[PDB]
Design a protein around this ligand. Structure first.
Ligand SMILES: [Ca+2]
Ligand SMILES: [Zn+2]
Ligand SMILES: [Zn+2]
Length: 486
C-alpha cells in the first residue's frame, strides 16, 4: 500500500520510479588468533551479565522498530509461566519452543535477550569498547566517525561489501563467535549455550553484534595481509614462525588498527596503512568473504574523500551554518528518501507514520530543500497532537529522536548542538532559517527537484495540498509550519 499522506503532499514525485567452504588450516589459524585477541579486547573492562525481565518489558515498550501485541503479551503473566518452563528446559540443555505461537516466538526472543543481550545493552560494540564498531551511534554521529577514520594517514579509504554476507559465514566464524561462552559462568553460561547451540540446527540484535564482531575480525586479518605479516604462502598452512608474528601484531597493533575502521554489521569502512590492502585478497577470499561486484582477484578500489564514501546507505557532508560553525550531516539520493516515505505497510497511522518520516527528515535531512519543505507540509497536514508511530529507521539500529510530539527545533538543538560531542560552541539555534541547507548544486546532484517547474508548481501551491489532507483526515487541531521556511 501507498501512504496517502506522503503521496498527496509529493505531486512532482508521482511519475518517478550450497557454498561457503570452510577455511584452510592457515586461514583458520590466523582467524582463531585474531578472534581470541578481539574477544579479550572486548572483555578487558566490561563484565557480562544477564538482562532482566524488567529490561525486556522496557525495551519492548520503547521505540525498538504488531509491535503492540508484544506489549500486551508481556503484561500477560501466562506468557512468563511459559518462559519459566522453557528456561528450565534449557538450564538442563534441552529446548522445544523457539494461539500460543506468539508466546513461543516472543519467549525465545526474551531467553536470547536474557542470555546474550548484554552485548547490545552494555554496548560491547559501541566504538569505545570495540574501537572499530559504531553501535548506538545515529546518523548525526556516523559522518564524524568517517571523518576521524578518514583523517588517519595511509592509503585510500576502502569500503568493500561481501557478496551475500550471511551466506558466507562459516562454521569457523560460528566457532569464533561462540567463544563468548568462555566469558560466562554458571547459569548464564548454560542459558547462553542453549541459545547459541540453536544456530547449529538470533535475533536481529544479537545477529548485529555477532556480524560486527566477525567483520571486525575479517578486516584485521585483511590488514595483517596488506601489511605483509602474512601472505599467499600462509593460506594453506601458515609458514613456520609466523604464528608468534601474528600474535605480536595483534598485541601491539590491534587497537590502533581498529580505530581505522567503522564497522556496522556486514558494512565497513577501512583506512589501511597503505594501498597494499587493495590486493590483500588471499585470506579474504579463502575466508569465503568474496567481495561484491568484482572479479575474485581484481584489486579493490577506494576513495580519497571521506565525504563520498558510502556507509550505512548514506554519504556524509560538511555543512557550514550561517554563524560559521560546521556540521557533518548524512545525505543520500532523494528519490529513495521520498520513495520509502510513500510506502505504507488506518488513517491515524498512515498520518502518524507520514509524520515520523517528516520529523526524521527535519532531524537528518533538513539540508535538502525539498525534504524540509515536504516535511513541514506533512507536519502542517497531520494533527499536532498525534504522536509519530511506525518504522522509518531502515536497518540502521540507532535513532528515533523524531518519534516525539516535542518541537522539532528543540530536538534538532539537542542532537546537533547540546549532545553533539563534535560541537564545541553550545549556543543554540533559535530559528529554522538558521539551520543550513546544502549548496544548491550539491542538492541537485543528490536528486533535488529544485529548479524544475513540476516542483515550482508544488512549492507555490503547497497550501492547497495541505488543506486537501486536512479535509480527508478531518476536524482536528493543525498548526502551520510553512512560515518556518523563508
Ligand atoms: Ca559498504
Ligand atoms: Zn528454547
Ligand atoms: Zn548527497
Amino acid at each position: 500500500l501507498v501512504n496517502g499522506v506522503v503521496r498527496l503532499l509529493s505531486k512532482p514525485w508521482d511519475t518517478i520510479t550450497t557454498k561457503a567452504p570452510e577455511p584452510p588450516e592457515g586461514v583458520k589459524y590466523v582467524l582463531n588468533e585474531t578472534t581470541n585477541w578481539l574477544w579479550a579486547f572486548l572483555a578487558r573492562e566490561k563484565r557480562p551479565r544477564m538482562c532482566s525481565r524488567e529490561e525486556f518489558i522496557r525495551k519492548v515498550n520503547s521505540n525498538a522498530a504488531q509491535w503492540r501485541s508484544a506489549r500486551e503479551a508481556v503484561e500477560d503473566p501466562k506468557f512468563w509461566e511459559m518462559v519459566d518452563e522453557e528456561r528450565e528446559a534449557h538450564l538442563r540443555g534441552e529446548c522445544h519452543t523457539c494461539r500460543a505461537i506468539w508466546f513461543m516466538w516472543l519467549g525465545a526472543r526474551f531467553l536470547e535477550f536474557e542470555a546474550l543481550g548484554f552485548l547490545n545493552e552494555d554496548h560491547w560494540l559501541g566504538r569505545k569498547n570495540s574501537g572499530g564498531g559504531v553501535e548506538g551511534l545515529g546518523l548525526q554521529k556516523l559522518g564524524y566517525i568517517l571523518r576521524e577514520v578518514g583523517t588517519r594517514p595511509g592509503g585510500r579509504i576502502y569500503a568493500d561489501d561481501t557478496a551475500g554476507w550471511d551466506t558466507r559465514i562459516t562454521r569457523a566464524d560460528l566457532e569464533n563467535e561462540a567463544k563468548v561462552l568462555e566469558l560466562l559462568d554458571g547459569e548464564h553460561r548454560r542459558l547462553a549455550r542453549a541459545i547459541i547451540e540453536l544456530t547449529y540446527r538470533s535475533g536481529q540484535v544479537v545477529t548485529y553484534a555477532l556480524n560486527t564482531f566477525t567483520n571486525l575480525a575479517v578486516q584485521l586479518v585483511r590488514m595483517m595481509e596488506g601489511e605483509g605479516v602474512i601472505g599467499p604462502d600462509d593460506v594453506e598452512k601458515l609458514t613456520k614462525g609466523k604464528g608468534p608474528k601474528v600474535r605480536t601484531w595483534l598485541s601491539e597493533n590491534g587497537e590502533e588498527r581498529l580505530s581505522r575502521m567503522a564497522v556496522s554489521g556486514d558494512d565497513c569502512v577501512v583506512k589501511p596503512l597503505d594501498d597494499r590492502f587493495a590486493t590483500s585478497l588471499h585470506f579474504l577470499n579463502a575466508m569465503s568473504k568474496v567481495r561484491k561486484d568484482i572479479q575474485e582477484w581484481k584489486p579493490s578500489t577506494g576513495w580519497y574523500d571521506w565525504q563520498q564514501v558510502p556507509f550505512c546507505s548514506n554519504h556524509f557532508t560538511e555543512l557550514i551554518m550561517k554563524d560559521g560553525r560546521t556540521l557533518v550531516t548524512p545525505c543520500r539520493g532523494q528519490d529513495e528518501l521520498v520513495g520509502r516515505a510513500r510506502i505504507s505497510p488506518n488513517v491515524r497511522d498512515t498520518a502518524c507514520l507520514a509524520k515520523s518520516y517528516a520529523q526524521m527528515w527535519l532531524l537528518l535531512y533538513f539540508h535538502r530543500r525539498d525534504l524540509r519543505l515536504m516535511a513541514n507540509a506533512i507536519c502542517s497536514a497531520v494533527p499536532v497532537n498525534w504522536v509519530p508511530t511506525g518504522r522509518t529507521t531502515w536497518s540502521i539500529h540507532a535513532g528515533g529522536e523524531w518519534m516525539t510530539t516535542e518541537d522539532m527545533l528543540e530536538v534538532w538543538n539537542r542532537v546537533w548542538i547540546e549532545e553533539n560531542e563534535w560541537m564545541e560552541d553550545k549556543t543554540p539555534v533559535e530559528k529554522w532559517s538558521d539551520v543550513p541547507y546544502s549548496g544548491k548544486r550539491e542538492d541537485i546532484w543528490c536528486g533535488s527537484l529544485i529548479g524544475t517547474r513540476a516542483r515550482a508548481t508544488w512549492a507555490e501551491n503547497i497550501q492547497v495540498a495541505i488543506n486537501q489532507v486536512r479535509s480527508i483526515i478531518g476536524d482536528e487541531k493543525y498548526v502551520d509550519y510553512m512560515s518556518s521556511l523563508k
